[PDB]
Design a binder for this molecule. Structure first.
Ligand SMILES: Nc1ncnc2c1ncn2[C@@H]1O[C@H](COP(=O)(O)OP(=O)(O)O)[C@@H](O)[C@H]1O
Ligand SMILES: Nc1ncnc2c1ncn2[C@@H]1O[C@H](COP(=O)(O)OP(=O)(O)O)[C@@H](O)[C@H]1O
Ligand SMILES: Nc1ncnc2c1ncn2[C@@H]1O[C@H](COP(=O)(O)OP(=O)(O)O)[C@@H](O)[C@H]1O
Ligand SMILES: Nc1ncnc2c1ncn2[C@@H]1O[C@H](COP(=O)(O)OP(=O)(O)O)[C@@H](O)[C@H]1O
Ligand SMILES: [Mg+2]
Ligand SMILES: [Mg+2]
Ligand SMILES: [Mg+2]
Ligand SMILES: [Mg+2]
Lengths: 464, 229, 464, 229
C-alpha cells in the first residue's frame, strides 16, 4: 500500500466513465491514453458499449479477465462509492478519482467514506477532484489535459486542478522536459510525501516541482524527513500558495481551515533543503536551470558580457540572492586579452565590449569553461548590428561541446525577434536561456541556492 | 523522575506548572536556571537566602496568581536578612489583600540575576509540523517588533546556530556599545534541549522561557512557563 | 540652449562620418534616417564623396547652403573637436556625438573641452558615447540600432549603450509603442533633467522609462523638482543600475567615481514620484500597463478567475505590493450568480470555477467593469479543456468595448501555445496581457503604485 | 545674527561649533534645546546650577574634546551643590589627565533632561542631491542596526511624516510596554527645520542632533554637533 511502482508503471488500467460521447472527461482520458502510446492493457468501462476506440469494453472492472492495477474513475460523485466497491472486489491497487464534488465543496463525510472503503480493500486513492496523472517513461497519459509533453526528468505535482492543468501545457511553451505530471487535488489519501518517496527512487526523475497550498495536520514532520533526504540528490522547488499572511488567511477562509503558519512553513522548507518560488516564472526558470545543469562545485562564477549595463543588472541581481563575484583567474584574463580591446574590463563581469563580433562569444565561452579555476558561467548578450543572435547562440553551443565538461551555464539575451528565436534555439538544446540578464542571473542563482540548501541539510544530518 | 512534576499537576487538574516546578523541570534537561528554594516560613526563607547567597528575589507561589508582579508578589534585589524578612511579610500581605482566596504553596527564594542581554526561547505545537522552537531577543524585539525565528524539532546544531543568526536583532549578541559578546554556544545548546523537551513530553503544549539572560559565559533562565494539555 | 524642440523636430540634419562603406556607423545612421522616413533635409558630410545614398554630399557642415539644426558626429575621437568647431561656425544648435573614447575610458579633459567648445558657439551636446536618438512623431531615426519601432507614447532614455540599443529592439517583441528613443551615454552636457523638460511638454509622450546609472553632482535637486512635476501627469519608471551596495560599488570602481548613495537615490525617487524597477521585465511589464490604462480612481480592485490556485498566486503577489482585496459589491455578486454555479466563490478573487466556458469571461468582465463600485479589474485564465484561449480573449475585448468606460484592466493567461497566441492577440490591441497570474498582478500593482506616488508628490506640494 | 557664530568660528580657523554654540544656533531656528550657561569657575558653575535648578549636567567645553564621555568629561544627574563641585574638579582633572594641553572655554552647565525616547536627527550633503535630512531611533537602532530614513531638503510636511513612519523601529514612538506615545508633530517640525538649516547655511557641512529626547509633549535636543566647511 506504500509502494507506487504499479501506479506509475501499471500492466493494466481501467477507465471508468468513458463513452461514445467524445466530450465526456472519461472519453478524453481514454483518448489521451491511446494517443500518448500506452503499451499495457487498457479496459474501457461502460454499461452499454461493446466497444470504445476499438477496445473491448466491460460493464464492470470486476468483469475484466485480468488484474487491473489502476482504475481511473470519472463517474458522478453519487456513483463513485459503488465503483470503489467493485474495484475492491476486483483487487484494484489504485483508485484515481477524477470526479469533483467532495470535501472541496463541503461534502467532507463522503470524502472520508471514499478513503475508508478504499482502505478496507487495500486500495489507495489519488485525489479526488483531480485531472489525472502522466508518466512519460511508461508512455502513460491518464489525464484530460494536453495530449503530449516534452520528455525529460522533471516531475510536476499540483494541488490545484485548473492551474495544474494549465501549467502542464505551459511546460511545452517553456521547453521543460517532463518525466511526470501528478494532479493530487484534495489529497484525501496519497499526498506529496508519498509521491516524493516514489520520485526519490525513480532514475527517470532528477527534479521535482510542486504547487502546494498546504499539507495535512500531523503530516509535516514526515514531510521534512522525506524531503530533506530527497534534497540530498534531487532539487525540490515549491510554488507555495498562501505564502503571505493575507493569502494564507484567504486560503483558510475558503476551506474553513486554520491558517497555516507562514513563518513555520518557511522554516520547514529550509530544513528540507527546498527552494520556495514566489511565482510561476521563477519556478519554471529555476527548474530549467536545475534540470539541465549540475551543481557548481565552487564559488568561481564568471559573468561574460558585451555590455556594461547588462553586467550591472546581473551583478545587482546576484547580490539580491547573496551571490558575489570575484576576480577572474589571470590565465582566463590573458587568454581573452588575445582578441579583446584595451578598454575591456576584467573585474568580473568580464566585459568584451559592445564591438564584440559573434566569434568572440565562442572564444570567450570556451576559454572560461575550459579554465580549471572557473566553476560556472553566465553569458549575457545585447543585440548589436555588429553581431547576429543566432551566430552568438551557435558559438555558445560550440564552446560548450568543445569544453567537454558540464559546468553550469545560463544565458541572457536582449533584443528583437531575432533574439527571441535564438533564445528558443538554445532552450531547445537544453541550454538555459532567457530574454533578460536578470532572469539568466536568477536562474544561475537557483543552482547556487540548491547547493547551499543541500549543504544545510547535510550539516543538519552531521553525526555527533 | 522530573515527569512526576507533570503527572502531579495533571492529577490536580492544573493546566500549568508553578514557577519552581517549571524551573526544576527544564533544569533536569540541562537548561541553566536561577538557583531556587521553596520557602514555607519567613525563617526558612532567610536560611535559604543565605545558602543561595545575596542578593535574592522573593516571589509568591500560588496556583491562583499567574501574574505575580501585577499584584505585588515579586520583590527583587534583597541584600540582607532584614530586607528578606521585610519583603516576605509585605508579599504575604500584598497578595492576601488583592487575592484573598489564594492557595499559598510558599514563597520562592531565588538568586538575583545581574543584567545581561535578554532572550526568549519558546516552544509551541504547529498543526502541521508539531513541536517547534522559537528564538528572539528579549524586550521590545519580540514583544513589539515580532523579530523571531523558528525551527521544527528536533533541532540539529545547524538548525540552532542558523536560527540565531537569522533574527534581525542578532548583532545584540556579538558585542555592541557597552556590552561584550555573549555565549552563543550556550544559547544553541539551550535551543536544542528546548526542542528535545517538546519532542519527548507530549503533555507539554507550550513552553516560554522568558526572560533568559545571556552572559559572556553561560545563560540563565529567569522565568519559565509550561502549559499542559 | 534649453529648448530641445529643434533637436527632436529639426528642419535639417547633418551626418558626419557617413561614407560609401555601408558598414560604417555613420553610414548605418544615414541609412536608418532615410528608411524610417525623415521629411526634412539630410546632409551627408564626407571629405571626398560628392553623393551618398542619392543625396548631395559636402566636405564640411559649414559648406551646406542651409541652417543645420543637428549634426550627428561619427568620426574618430581625435577628429571630433575639429568637427565641433566647424559645426559651431555653421550655427549648429545640437551636436549628437556618437563617438566613443572620452571620459568613459579615462579621457576626462577631452570631454570637458568638447562641451566647452560647443557652448562657446551656443551649441548643446548629446553624449558623447551614444548610439543616437529616435523621435517617431518626426519620423526621425538617427540611430545605428533597429530601423523601426512600434509607434506609441513611451519615451525611453538609456545611459547604457549596448543594453539601450538592445532594449530598443526588445520593445517590438514586447509590443511597447515608442514615441522616442534617446541614448544619453556619458551625459557630458544634455542629461535626464533636460530631456524630462521636453517630454513634459510633448503631447506625443505619455510615459517615460529611464535606464539610469547615476546623475551629475549638484544636479539632483533640480532632478527632483522637474521629475516630481512631470509625475503629476506622466509616470516615470527608472531602471536603476547600481541598486545594491555591491552594484553601486562596482559602477563606482569602473569609473573610479565615488559610489552614489543607494538609500538617498531611493528617497529622491520617492520624492519624485518615480517607480523604481529592479529589472528589465518589471520595467517593461509596468510600462505596458501604464501606457495603455488610466490610473484607478479608487481601491475597489476586482480579480476574476476560473481557478482558485491562480487567484491565490494573485492575492499573494498583490499583498507583496501593498494591495489588499475587499469583498465585491453585492450588486456584482448577484449579477454573476445569474449564470454561475452554487460553489463559486465571491470573496474576491471572484472564482467562476474551472468549468467556466468562454462566454462567462465575457459576462463576468462586462458585469465587473460596468459596476459603479468597481475601480479596476485583473482577469485570470487557466487553460482548461472546456475553453479556448482566443475565445476568452475575444470575450474580454468585447466586454471592454461594451463596458465603454476606461477602467484599468490587466490579464494573466496560463497555458500552452494557444495561450501564447491569445496573449499576443491581447497585447497587439493594447490590452495588457501576461503569461502568468503574478505578472498580470504586478502590472496592475504598478498602476496603483503610480497613483500612490502621484499622491505623495501632490501632498508634498501642498501650500502652507 | 546667529550667523555671527558661524563667522566667528570661521575667523578662528575652527571647523565645528562648540556644544553651546551649536545649541544656540539650532535654537534660533526653533529647534528646542537645553539651558546652556557657560561657567568659567567652580563658583559660577554652582550659581548656574542653582539658577537652572537640579538635577544638572556638567560638560567640558573645549575645541579639543569632540567625544566628551570618552575623556571622562561628562557628569550627569547632579542634584546637590556638593555633587556639582564634586563633578567640576573631577571633569577638569579627567581632561587635564587625558588631553593635558586643551583649550578650555569653560564648563557647560545644563539641566538634566528626564528620560524619554531617544532620537537622532541628521543633516548631510550628498554630492548629487545636496542637503539631506536623516532620521532614526537612538542608541543601537542607528548605531548598530543602521535603521535610518532620508529625505532631500527642503522637506515638506509629507516628507517629514512619511520618513518617520518609514524606519523599522517606528513603533517605539507610538507607545509600548512602559512608554507612552511621543509628540510626532514636534519631531516633524524639527526635521523640517533641520532641512531649512541645511538649505540656507552653505557653510554647514554636517549636523548631528544626537541624542534628541522625545516626550508625550515636545522634544529636547541634548547634544548637538555642527561641522563647518
Ligand atoms: N481560492 C482557494 N483558496 C484556497 N484553496 C482553494 C481555493 N480554491 C480551491 N481550493 C482548494 O484547492 C484544492 C484543489 O481543488 P481544485 O478544484 O482543483 O482547485 P482550483 O480552483 O485551483 O482548480 C481543494 O482542496 C480546494 O478546496
Ligand atoms: N531572579 C531574578 N533575577 C533577576 N530579575 C528577575 C528575577 N526574577 C524576576 N526578575 C525580573 O522581574 C520580572 C517580573 O518577574 P516574573 O518572574 O517575570 O513574574 P511575572 O511575569 O509572572 O509577573 C521578570 O520579567 C524579570 O525581568
Ligand atoms: N563594469 C562596469 N560597471 C559599471 N558600469 C560599467 C561597467 N563597464 C561599463 N560600464 C558602463 O559604462 C556606460 C557608459 O556608456 P556605454 O559605454 O555606452 O554603455 P555600455 O557599456 O552598456 O555599452 C554605463 O552605462 C555603464 O553601464
Ligand atoms: N543635558 C542632558 N540631559 C540628560 N542626559 C544627558 C544630557 N547631556 C548628556 N546626556 C546623556 O549623556 C550622554 C553623553 O553626553 P554627550 O553630550 O552625548 O557627550 P558625548 O556624545 O560627546 O560623549 C548622552 O548621550 C546622553 O545620554
Ligand atoms: Mg562597455
Ligand atoms: Mg514575566
Ligand atoms: Mg475552483
Ligand atoms: Mg552623544
Amino acid at each position: 500500500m506504500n509502494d507506487l511502482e504499479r501506479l506509475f508503471n501499471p500492466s493494466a488500467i481501467a477507465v471508468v466513465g468513458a463513452s461514445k460521447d467524445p466530450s465526456k472527461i472519461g472519453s478524453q482520458i481514454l483518448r489521451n491514453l491511446l494517443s500518448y502510446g500506452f503499451k499495457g492493457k487498457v479496459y474501457p468501462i461502460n454499461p452499454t458499449a461493446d466497444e470504445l476506440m476499438g477496445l473491448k469494453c466491460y460493464p464492470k472492472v470486476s468483469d475484466v479477465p485480468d488484474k487491473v492495477d489502476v482504475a481511473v474513475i470519472s463517474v458522478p460523485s453519487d456513483k463513485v462509492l459503488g465503483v470503489i466497491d467493485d474495484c475492491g472486489k476486483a483487487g484494484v491497487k489504485f483508485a484515481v478519482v477524477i470526479t469533483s464534488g467532495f470535501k472541496e465543496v463541503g461534502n467532507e463525510e463522503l470524502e472520508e467514506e471514499l478513503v475508508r472503503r478504499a482502505h478496507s480493500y487495500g486500495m489507495r486513492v489519488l485525489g479526488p477532484n483531480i485531472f489525472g496523472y502522466l508518466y512519460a517513461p511508461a508512455r502513460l497519459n491518464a489525464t484530460f489535459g494536453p495530449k503530449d509533453v516534452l520528455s525529460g526528468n522533471v516531475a510536476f505535482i499540483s494541488q490545484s486542478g485548473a492551474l495544474g492543468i494549465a501549467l502542464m501545457g505551459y511546460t511545452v511553451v517553456e521547453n521543460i522536459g517532463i518525466s511526470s505530471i501528478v494532479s493530487v487535488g484534495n489529497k484525501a489519501d496519497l499526498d506529496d510525501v508519498d509521491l516524493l518517496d516514489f520520485f526519490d527512487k525513480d532514475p527517470n526523475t532528477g527534479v521535482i516541482m510542486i504547487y502546494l497550498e498546504g499539507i495535512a495536520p500531523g503530516r509535516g514532520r514526515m514531510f521534512i524527513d522525506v524531503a530533506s533526504r530527497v534534497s540530498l540528490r534531487k532539487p525540490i522547488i515549491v510554488i507555495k500558495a498562501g505564502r503571505t499572511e493575507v493569502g494564507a488567511r484567504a486560503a483558510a477562509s475558503h476551506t474553513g481551515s486554520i491558517a497555516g503558519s507562514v513563518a513555520i512553513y518557511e522554516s520547514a522548507f529550509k530544513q528540507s533543503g527546498i527552494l520556495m518560488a514566489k511565482s510561476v516564472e521563477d519556478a519554471f526558470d529555476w527548474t530549467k536551470a536545475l534540470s539541465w545543469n549540475p551543481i557548481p562545485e565552487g564559488e568561481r562564477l564568471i559573468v561574460l558580457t558585451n555590455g556594461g549595463g547588462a553586467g550591472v543588472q546581473s551583478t545587482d541581481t546576484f547580490a539580491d540572492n547573496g551571490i558575489y563575484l570575484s576576480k577572474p583567474p589571470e590565465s582566463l584574463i590573458q587568454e581573452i586579452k588575445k582578441f579583446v580591446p584595451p578598454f575591456a574590463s576584467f573585474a568580473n563581469p568580464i566585459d568584451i565590449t559592445g564591438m564584440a563580433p559573434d566569434d568572440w562569444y565562442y572564444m570567450g565561452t570556451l576559454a572560461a569553461l575550459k579554465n580549471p579555476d572557473v566553476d560556472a558561467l553566465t553569458v549575457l548578450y545585447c543585440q548589436t548590428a555588429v553581431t547576429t543572435p543566432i551566430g552568438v547562440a551557435k558559438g555558445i553551443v560550440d564552446a560548450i561541446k568543445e569544453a567537454g565538461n558540464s559546468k553550469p551555464v545560463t544565458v541572457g539575451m536582449v533584443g528583437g525577434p531575432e533574439v527571441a528565436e535564438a533564445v528558443s534555439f538554445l532552450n531547445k538544446q537544453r541550454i538555459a536561456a532567457y530574454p533578460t540578464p536578470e532572469r539568466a542571473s536568477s536562474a544561475m542563482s537557483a543552482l547556487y541556492a540548491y547547493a547551499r540548501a543541500r549543504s544545510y541539510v547535510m550539516k543538519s544530518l552531521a553525526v555527533r | 523522575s522530573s515527569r512526576d512534576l507533570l503527572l502531579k499537576a495533571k492529577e490536580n487538574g492544573r493546566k500549568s506548572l508553578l514557577e519552581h516546578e517549571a524551573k526544576y523541570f527544564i533544569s533536569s534537561y540541562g537548561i541553566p536556571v536561577t538557583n531556587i528554594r521553596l520557602a514555607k516560613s519567613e525563617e526558612e526563607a532567610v536560611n535559604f537566602s543565605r545558602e543561595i547567597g545575596f542578593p535574592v528575589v522573593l516571589k509568591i507561589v500560588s496556583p491562583q496568581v499567574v501574574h505575580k508582579s501585577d499584584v505585588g508578589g515579586v520583590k527583587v534585589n534583597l541584600r540582607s536578612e532584614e530586607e528578606v524578612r521585610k519583603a516576605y511579610r509585605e508579599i504575604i500581605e500584598n497578595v492576601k489583600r488583592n487575592v484573598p482566596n489564594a492557595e499559598i504553596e510558599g514563597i520562592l527564594v531565588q538568586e538575583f540575576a545581574p543584567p545581561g542581554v535578554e532572550l526568549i526561547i519558546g516552544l509551541l505545537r504547529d498543526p502541521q509540523f508539531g513541536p517547534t522552537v522559537m528564538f528572539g531577543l528579549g524586550g521590545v524585539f519580540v514583544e513589539l517588533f515580532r523579530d523571531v525565528s523558528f525551527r521544527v524539532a528536533p533541532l540539529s546544531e545547524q538548525d540552532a546556530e542558523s536560527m540565531i543568526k537569522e533574527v534581525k536583532a542578532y548583532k545584540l549578541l556579538t558585542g555592541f556599545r557597552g556590552m561584550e559578546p555573549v555565549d552563543i554556544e550556550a544559547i544553541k545548546d539551550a535551543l536544542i534541549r528546548a526542542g528535545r523537551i517538546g519532542v519527548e513530553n507530549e503533555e507539554i503544549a507550550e513552553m516560554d522561557l522568558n526572560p533568559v539572560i545571556a552572559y559572556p559565559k553561560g545563560i540563565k533562565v529567569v522565568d519559565a512557563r509550561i502549559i499542559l494539555r
